[PDB]
Amino acid sequence: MDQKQFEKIRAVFDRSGVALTLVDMSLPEQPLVLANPPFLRMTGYTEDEILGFNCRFLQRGDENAQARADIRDALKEGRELQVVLRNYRKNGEPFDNLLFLHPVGGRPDAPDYFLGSQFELGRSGNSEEAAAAGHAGALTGELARIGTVAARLEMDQRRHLAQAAAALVRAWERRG
């Protein structure tokens, strides 16, 4: 909750062209504390409907049982994760979501935040793999700007996140 740290992330979020969210890991309930305009456009919510609340309102019923188990594990362990979720907009229209999770701040044993970035699937025609990799590359630029990914390491992280995203998209496309 360092002041310089929070506003530094806020400014990056406000300007970014990719959906970004930030959750406060200082409480078990993990409330959302930042959500930027691209995320708001995706989901159909206002900043006030979501800020101070956990991110699970995007789901309905229990269709992401495995993904939820994996997210819980990654959050508790402070690990990066990429995973596809079935989500719903405020108006109820369903959409599939490649979610990128990244720990921010604190120490490897205990980050202060987790950053979320959501890539909407099913709106990139024949090129879901490339568009998801494109999103991973834009996201990595934002991580570098926040400071979470070091400058000397940005190209490796971009390669890694882009291949991980394409691989997950390949699996999602062949599931059905």
Ligand X SMILES: Cc1cc2nc3c(=O)[nH]c(=O)nc-3n(C[C@H](O)[C@H](O)[C@H](O)COP(=O)(O)O)c2cc1C
Coil, strand, or helix at residue 87?
Answer: strand
Q: Which of 28-36, 66-74, 95-103, 163-171 is the region at the interface with a copy of itself (rule: CB under 8 A)?
A: 163-171
Asked if residue 137 binds a copy of itself (CB under 8 A), the reply is: yes
Asked if residue 72 binds ligand X (CB under 6 A), the reply is: yes
**Which of Ca ion, a copy of itself, ligand X, none binds 129 (CB below 5-8 Å, type-dependent)?**
a copy of itself
Task: Supply the minimum distance, in Å, between the C-beta of residue 49 and ligand X.
Answer: 14
Among 12, 34, 84, 85, binds ligand X (CB under 6 A): 85
Among 78, 86, 130, 147, binds a copy of itself (CB under 8 A): 130
Task: Supply the minimum distance, in Å, between the C-beta of residue 100 and a copy of itself.
Answer: 12
**What residues pair up with 116 in beta bridges, in sequence order?**
21, 101
DSSP 8-state assignment for residue 148? S
Do 54 and 31 contact (CB within 8 A), yes or no? yes
Phi and psi angles of residue 82, each rounded to the nearest 5 degrees, phi first: -125, 135
Task: Supply the minimum distance, in Å, between the C-beta of residue 144 and Ca ion.
Answer: 9
Distance between alpha carbon 171 and the CA centroid of its chain, in Å? 19
- Nearest Cα to Cα of residue 111 among 67, 157, 147: 147
Asked if residue 165 binds a copy of itself (CB under 8 A), the reply is: yes
Signed CA dihedral, 148, 80, 106, 22: sign only: positive
Tell me the Cα Rg of the chain.
15
Residue 33 vs 74, nearer CB to Ca ion: 33
**Which of a copy of itself, ligand X, Ca ion, none binds 141 (CB below 5-8 Å, type-dependent)?**
a copy of itself
Known binding-site positions for Mg(2+): 76, 109
